[PDB]
């Protein structure tokens, strides 16, 4: 009965839409895609007008659910900015074949209690049909706010076409046309096993590279060294500890601490996602009859501990909490590679 949710709202939203067409997103799509990547944005070729600061993060999303969900179901996961007079007809049409992720500002969502700010990024919800009252039902896919919410046709249209529009939400839909054929549905776990093997091969291949963009040089590294490289890079923000432990700060020093804290907050959401994804993989592996390959090993627990160490650090930026995050990450990296090698041997 209850609403599905995840550490990334768009993932929790996609999981609700997948469940409508008989797809277990966490187990068969997220869990089938074993991934680990360090990502950096840094100085590259001038000019890069959108490079505001050196930035480091982590992802366990790999190719991401839009890619895997589309090819596994034989459907499409398509972004469109649709005109206002096509929006409601689009939501009805999408529901027949799956559903829609509808973008809105945080301030349009009363449960977020964010009237004074559209926030750093737009929010997303899943329209879940119209009720007798004529109100629309909206699914919230982020764990913290998880639940179903009511909104009038008038408020929904106003939410989809805000003015001003910093995030460019105007009619922004992601259409999930993802209903598998009965035959493809019957084969979903076979496709999940093929995807599981493919991501583990990518992981051990450990590709790395860099690309120049107007937003900086984007550097990435996959595989077993992704987390060790992340930890080496994150040691560069150790200056935040003495800075955050001071009752006086210039506008610049305050910005440095605020942005540094944001780096560890964003990273902590990715660690939560990693715990979510690895838990999905554990469920997939168990259903496939492969738990016997990895007895003992709990990468879900190692990432949950890294996630908790992250939360401690962004809530209180001190040297102890920083060291504790680094140790927790190094432990997850160890459990991940042991698990991945054992599992791929059996696929």
């Amino acid at each position: 009965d209850q609403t599905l949710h995840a550490p990334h709202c768009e993932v929790g939203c996609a999981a609700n839409v997948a469940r409508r067409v008989g797809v277990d997103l966490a187990r068969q799509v997220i869990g089938a895609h074993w991934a680990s990547r360090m990502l950096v944005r840094e100085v590259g070729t001038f000019p890069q007008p959108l490079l505001d600061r050196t930035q480091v993060t982590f992802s366990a999303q790999g190719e991401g659910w839009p890619a895997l969900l589309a090819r596994m179901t034989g459907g499409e996961v398509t972004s469109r900015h649709v005109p206002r007079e096509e929006l409601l007809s689009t939501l009805h049409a999408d529901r027949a074949e799956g559903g829609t992720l509808l973008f809105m500002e945080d301030r349009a969502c009363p449960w977020l209690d964010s009237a004074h700010s559209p926030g750093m990024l737009p929010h997303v919800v899943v329209p879940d049909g119209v009720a007798p009252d004529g109100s629309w039902q909206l699914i919230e896919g982020h764990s913290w706010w998880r639940g179903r919410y009511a909104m009038s046709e008038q408020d929904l249209l106003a939410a989809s076409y805000p003015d001003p529009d910093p995030h460019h939400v105007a009619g922004r839909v992601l259409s999930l046309r993802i209903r598998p054929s009965a035959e493809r549905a019957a084969q979903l776990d076979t496709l999940a096993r093929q995807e599981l093997a493919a991501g583990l091969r990518t992981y051990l291949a450990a590709e790395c590279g860099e690309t120049e963009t107007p937003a900086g040089r984007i550097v990435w590294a996959n595989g077993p060294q992704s987390v060790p490289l992340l930890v080496e890079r994150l040691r560069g923000w150790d200056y935040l500890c003495p800075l955050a432990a001071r009752n006086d700060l210039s506008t610049e020093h305050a910005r440095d601490v605020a942005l540094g804290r944001y780096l560890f907050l964003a990273l902590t959401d990715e660690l939560a996602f990693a715990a979510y994804a690895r838990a999905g993989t554990l469920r997939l592996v168990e259903g496939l009859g492969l738990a016997g390959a990895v007895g003992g090993l709990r990468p879900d627990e190692a990432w949950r501990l890294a996630w908790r160490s992250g939360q401690k650090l962004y809530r209180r930026l001190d040297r102890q909490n920083l060291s504790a995050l680094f140790s927790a990450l190094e432990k997850a990296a160890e459990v991940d590679v042991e698990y991945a090698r054992r599992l791929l041997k059996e696929l």
Partner: protein, 77 residues
Amino acid sequence: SLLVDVLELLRPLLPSADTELTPDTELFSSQLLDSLALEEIQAAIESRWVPLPPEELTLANFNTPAAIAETIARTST
């Protein structure tokens, strides 16, 4: 006793010793408590009962002492 334990753990986290704490006191939606108090509740549970993964950190599970006690009870057996 589980509801009693939750109330005792929460009393030190409140703004003042004059803040009233009932089983139904809204903790987070009110902005009575913030993420620094949330960290203390997570760490207590991590230490005394079953560590909670991200899926259990919901406003629904944390917004009242009664909800926190029910979260601990559901996730311990």
